Amino acid sequence: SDSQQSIKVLEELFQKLSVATADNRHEIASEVASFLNGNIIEHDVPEHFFGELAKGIKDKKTAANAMQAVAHIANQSNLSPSVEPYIVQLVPAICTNAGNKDKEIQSVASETLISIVNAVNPVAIKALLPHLTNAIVETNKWQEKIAILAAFSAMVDAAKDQVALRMPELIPVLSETMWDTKKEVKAAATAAMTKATETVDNKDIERFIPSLIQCIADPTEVPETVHLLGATTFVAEVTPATLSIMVPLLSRGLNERETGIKRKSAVIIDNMCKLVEDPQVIAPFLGKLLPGLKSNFATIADPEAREVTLRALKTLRRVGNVGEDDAIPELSHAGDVSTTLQVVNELLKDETVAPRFKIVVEYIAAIGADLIDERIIDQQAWFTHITPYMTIFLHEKKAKDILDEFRKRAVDNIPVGPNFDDEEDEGEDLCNCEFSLAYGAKILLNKTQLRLKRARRYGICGPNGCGKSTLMRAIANGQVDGFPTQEECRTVYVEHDIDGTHSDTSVLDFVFESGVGTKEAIKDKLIEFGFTDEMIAMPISALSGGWKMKLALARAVLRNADILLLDEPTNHLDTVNVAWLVNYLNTCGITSITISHDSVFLDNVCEYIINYEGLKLRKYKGNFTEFVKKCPAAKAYEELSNTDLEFKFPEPGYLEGVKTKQKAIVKVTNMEFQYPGTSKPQITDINFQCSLSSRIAVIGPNGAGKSTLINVLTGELLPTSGEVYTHENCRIAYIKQHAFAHIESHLDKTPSEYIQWRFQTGEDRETMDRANRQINENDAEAMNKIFKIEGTPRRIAGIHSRRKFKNTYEYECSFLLGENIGMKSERWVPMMSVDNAWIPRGELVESHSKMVAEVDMKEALASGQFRPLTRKEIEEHCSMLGLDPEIVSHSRIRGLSGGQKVKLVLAAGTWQRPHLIVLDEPTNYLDRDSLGALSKALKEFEGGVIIITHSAEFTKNLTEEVWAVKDGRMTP
Amino acid sequence: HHHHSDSQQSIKVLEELFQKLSVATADNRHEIASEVASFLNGNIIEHDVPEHFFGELAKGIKDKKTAANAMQAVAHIANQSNLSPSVEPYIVQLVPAICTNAGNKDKEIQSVASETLISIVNAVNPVAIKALLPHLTNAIVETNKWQEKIAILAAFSAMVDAAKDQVALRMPELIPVLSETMWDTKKEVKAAATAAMTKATETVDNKDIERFIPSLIQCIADPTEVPETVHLLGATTFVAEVTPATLSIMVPLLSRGLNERETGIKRKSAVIIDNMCKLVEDPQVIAPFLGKLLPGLKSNFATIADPEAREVTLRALKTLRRVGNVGEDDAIPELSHAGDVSTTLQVVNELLKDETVAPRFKIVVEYIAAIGADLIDERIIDQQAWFTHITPYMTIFLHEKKAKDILDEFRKRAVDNIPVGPNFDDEEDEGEDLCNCEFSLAYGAKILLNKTQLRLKRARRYGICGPNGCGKSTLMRAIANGQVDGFPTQEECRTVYVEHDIDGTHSDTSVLDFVFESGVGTKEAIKDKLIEFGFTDEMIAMPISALSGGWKMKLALARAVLRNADILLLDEPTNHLDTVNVAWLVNYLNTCGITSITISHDSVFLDNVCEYIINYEGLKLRKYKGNFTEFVKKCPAAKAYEELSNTDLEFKFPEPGYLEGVKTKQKAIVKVTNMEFQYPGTSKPQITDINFQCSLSSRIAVIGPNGAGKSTLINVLTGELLPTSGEVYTHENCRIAYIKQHAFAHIESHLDKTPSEYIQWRFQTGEDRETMDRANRQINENDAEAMNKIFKIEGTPRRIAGIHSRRKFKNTYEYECSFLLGENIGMKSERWVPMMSVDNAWIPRGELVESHSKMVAEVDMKEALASGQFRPLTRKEIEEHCSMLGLDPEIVSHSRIRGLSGGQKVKLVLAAGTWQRPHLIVLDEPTNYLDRDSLGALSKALKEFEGGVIIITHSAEFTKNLTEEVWAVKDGRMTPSGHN
């Protein structure tokens, strides 16, 4: 009913839109958007509307209007998942419009494409990308190609991790476009190419990227570029993105003319491919290299060139895992959209899915497939991204039960990659053993192997109590079958030596007694290690935090160690001293094996990880983080990273005048909202109060009234009538699933940088201005927007202050008056103070975000409400929400779990220590586990709580007040 | 003068060596080339040049039959670590002919040339670019042989990596040349030119236009893509300063964009011109480009009708005129010719008017002028800097004292031509002014500032700098107490002088009451912020007297927040603060969102916090965009702010590392007996019957004019030449440091590195790349098919399979190598079969480095670890070490070398050379490139050195009271004289 009301509102608004002119177009587009993205329809979609929208886009007369509506609907912070799939479905029709002969239509189209790319859940990239590749490949309209190329570029910044994985498919499309006959298209393609390469993220070939792009543009530079790449010594993993950029060059190198080049190409092929840890990775490229290698092997006289070529050929065969007769193995299809789609369709065989929801099922399938390529398999991650789409036609409980199952089956398709080899790596072996390990009749390791390379740094991991320390002690004592003797390979178990020196004994004599060289030789090294004479002569009993560690390592040098064994070395060590340790280990030139609960430490030190898997040791190339990507079970170990518990929200910020938690800090009266154009207001005669003790639950089915109430409450929509009050310093945190899903656009940042990214402008970019496009940042000219005040044309000359205006902010603006408009003598003259005027935030942000920001910062500071984005403050805040300080300031979000990402996003959402927390359907994307922790946190929250839900079970023992909208009205 | 015998002997040796060279075949070519090289680069001739030798070389390069041989000699002579300034200018003079050969029909001659050009580019003093560059640009422009063009383009590329900073300033000259080359009909040349162009863009020191570089280059190739490229050009967020390199790449695009038909493109062009140019800080930078932008903008303004496009065009025009300092009638400001070679050349010639400079020294005077021209462009004005780079060429034909006196006048006159420059502009930056004053400042009747101005922007960060005692603190106090005329009152702009507040709080008062007593809000409100700030409940309740230094600072910033400060004033805020707390302060100042003014002797702290630098200059205040590092670029004089006292110039060398079996400083750690060296091909040994010893107490002076004997003796002493006969005892662990001027000049190729990184670079392979293997090309990094070098052992062809150990051999090292024996070598069955340990053999280091450097470094590294001599390159050790040499630790790990002065680069180079704590320091003619101040400090350092010192010099004055042992070569013989 209140839901059937929504369908009507959309009709009125869409009616006004189709008639819209270039003058009011944006005004109504905005309305359509603010309404459509709200909780307006109960378990269904406004089918007719989308139908008219679709039709409107294909008609010259309404093309501009329809699309401009989409652009607004698809803004960066408010695109509702209930709407998203239907919007992406319009991309094709919109691409055609990007090729229309009419300038306005063509322009709006291009614009809309960028809007969408920046609006969709980055993970749904497999639902959107094919549309763009299909279009640009099949069209003959050059302008259309340029618009699509520009959308590709926007996508690089919008979904970088996601695009990286698509590289092998995207690079050849851009490469072909680089050869278009239209000069404008050649220009555009190269630019998109350069932008796209930003996802390679490989330090080893970075500097040569512009040399590779040029080569794609001109083959004649291949020999030149091959000659230029010979020396690149590869260290970082060779990803699919690396290959898509390298292989084509090399392939042309092999089929070159001169023997020198063929040889060089081979070297580069060999050098680079050996660093391919996964065969699936090199599979799609094998076809472009094998044939050229086989061929040259037969055709070139010189034997040196041959040996090289063979070596490359052999390398390729080994890594590729090619079957006999050079047959490339069958690629896994666990990530193939076609595959994930079958799984979902299958799981959906018995529930009656109407036709209008088919597109949604498709979306879900796409997202699912991408999560598998990204290897995101934890339950919360999937609930975060798919559940919201499913409740579009299913009930939460059913959707969640079906979802959990979909993830379990989709994950099971993930192929079991192989395990490691060391021989061809760089090192003269310190040991190579086959052995078993028993500690008191208990088997720790059985018929396993251990090979350590010289000057290499290792880390040993495994579930607590698996025998990590016993193994190290064993190595330390030479109780591993086949291990070299101390004379062949000196091991030094750092800080684990036992002797009988008096606490009286000096540091010098302490080491002297170890029989490691003359006292002279000892002072020498101790001084070189930073010891002062005073220290060398003092009693060991006085060495502090860092100095015993330093002393030990110094002894290791004098002992001429070959391997340094360390067990929880960072204990009792401060940050400077840990930093010191990290630097030393990375530069002492000796092999070191470490056991440490500090994953940050391990990431900074280890080059390899030896993991306990059963009664077997398994080697992985990379640090702890790289380790975890290749071995999920590790996220359940006892490392600093895996640590996850419950959380607490911070105490709200001080408020003067508020003595009791029952005092109203927000009180609305006779409030009413009505979209310009609708027949009757969406909500009216509204009255309510909020306090630090509030515990409200906005229940009921989605409808025109219920959403609009949420939208006025959260500041999005400015009430059309009535009085609104709130403390000057009252802050409301709005928690939507949007932020949870969209954090995937920042896997490259540390939790702390993410919090800065969302906060430095002074306000939460995630929730503030949800009713505006904001997409404006490169608008040097969009700053010349003309404001109509007192019937005169004006440009903003400056914004000076701020003040509350109902549920938002107004800003004091000085102006420039337009004169002789349209004439050669047109000029904008500065006006006087007297003519300044207050302008609502919504009318400024789109063209003057920067000035608005500088103003918000001032007022923040002037009211003492500003909280500084310092790494210390952010770690403290994140601590409360269950995240560890070291991980918050040094680890990249990419390594976090779905659950941890939940904490981080909540942390972000509550950083300004709000007084009222408004949660938008939290059960719609959080599993029972996450829901639990959230429940307790909300019970203990010292501020007001407003939960928008459908789950009564979730509201019980949590809320006490109830808000319900019936016929555009409601009563507390 | 007085004839110098040993020196005359050198002329004869080079004659015998040249005769062997002109006869050399592709087989033994490299062998003699190396011979010629090692000899010619030594202290072989007294104040002169081997005139006829360079003539023979030039004549041989021009002759088919000897081109290859002669050029190969030039290549070895021009190696990366040993080219001597006594020869450098003569070598460069040969480039023209070498370029011509790069276009020779002969496959071999053409190839050797190409390689030689790369060799010279990588060997010259980067600072002498202006002497080399012209040869290459002129050569590529007038030649019609495409192969020559490809060779020269390769040389340009090499230059970018060899002298990045220097090339950056040459961009506006290089880019047009490369652009033309891209229009060459020959397909291979176009590709090659485009590659060189891509490489050159690397001089653009920012990322502003990274994603558009390939497009800009493609656009130069096909100008019909200009319109679309102007569209793509939404770099709109231009942030870094626009330099000559940036302009050289942008202006040609934008200039064509202005002349394009569509008004949309004329408009877009102007928008970009506007946004980019208002980031130009020196009008002289854009001056040479104005002529390609002013006319189009003027024309478009008169031609376009659309008002918007007109506004945008005009705006760009106003910005261009402002930033370009254009005068009346749009006249381009007079270009300063301070950096023109013609200008510095005129200056030196004038100073040398009463000095008879023979025709054979004319090339040197020109070389000297080129260098001086670059120093000015690079704004390198200190005395030591010039003495490091120019004095060594000058003594080719002048006595040191005369050279130094004229050099010092040359420097002063050249530097005086540097245009003073217009001040900086804050207006178009991002901020609403907090203030804008015109004022004078007096303190006790003493004038600190006379009629100057001060403009501060909200939320911006400034640093105040000025020579010691200029009044920086008084100005801050003045601001804090509103004593700067026209400054806002406290109500309008609340300033807080952090930690400089005075009140009468008891040492008993709790932190909370302390803040409360200042009347800054209720106690509840105060607690909320302190906690938000990081204070615990315990601390808020404890007595203020209990707070550490770190918390008093944090408390002081918290109070400023409660007072709603608009400006934070900080004076020496890092004092009494550990690195953690300083790190925290940095972080807070960068995110508090409040304007802050800082005074700190810590340039590193200034760099992490400051966006602008307000510098005291005379009695005026001058603003500069950027932090301290950027500031010092525009104001070179700033590198001497901590100079006033003579003590800051001193340094100490490290204690030589421990050696077992040496209990007296007289104990010989090096002993050479019956030593003799004779170049294969010379009629007699250069030195013979040589006996000497070195101990930790050595204090030797290798006196006498330059000569064949003196130089060779030194060359054996330092490890370069392996003796032909005689015994050599050395210790398994004895280390020698060879300080040559080369390292001091070539550090100008690493201005981008921090001192710490520079040292890491020099010892990358565990050994000093500057002084090790000076007799080898070693430029083999991309040596993949040269590792397939076939070693003939016991008459059998073999390839090295692996190097396993090291052992001392004479004055160098031999390596324990495992082999791979080849069978059917040339046939299709050729297979290099690995041999057994029993066939391993010991090969001298000289024979492995050029083809197996990596493997050798790995062994040298194991031996260092095993002998417990290895010195890890940890930040702490490097800092600790450089501090001994008189360099601040902060600077060493965080500041770029570009910001150091000539005197500071000297400390750094010395720090690099003594990093491994040698037991003997051998200094090659230190007085030839060090000014009085530097020599003073060095002499004291050498006098105190706990290891041995060997000084090769001509100055008896410098050695008086330093050395007592004397080494004087006479007729190929030398017997130590003196005492200890």
Ligand SMILES: Nc1ncnc2c1ncn2[C@@H]1O[C@H](COP(=O)(O)OP(=O)(O)NP(=O)(O)O)[C@@H](O)[C@H]1O
């Ligand atoms: N049109 C829609 N699009 C997307 N999600 C929706 C839509 N309508 C409801 N939801 C979500 O579906 C979930 C509600 O599931 P549901 O089974 O209806 O709960 P419930 O306890 O049965 N409430 P009820 O339907 O009143 O009995 C919530 O997350 C809603 O936000």
Ligand SMILES: Nc1ncnc2c1ncn2[C@@H]1O[C@H](COP(=O)(O)OP(=O)(O)NP(=O)(O)O)[C@@H](O)[C@H]1O
């Ligand atoms: N051929 C040369 N090329 C470059 N530099 C040289 C050459 N010959 C000498 N020098 C340098 O010229 C400087 C010597 O100048 P000089 O005036 O001879 O010093 P001195 O103390 O007066 N010794 P003396 O010449 O015996 O009176 C030293 O730096 C030499 O290394």
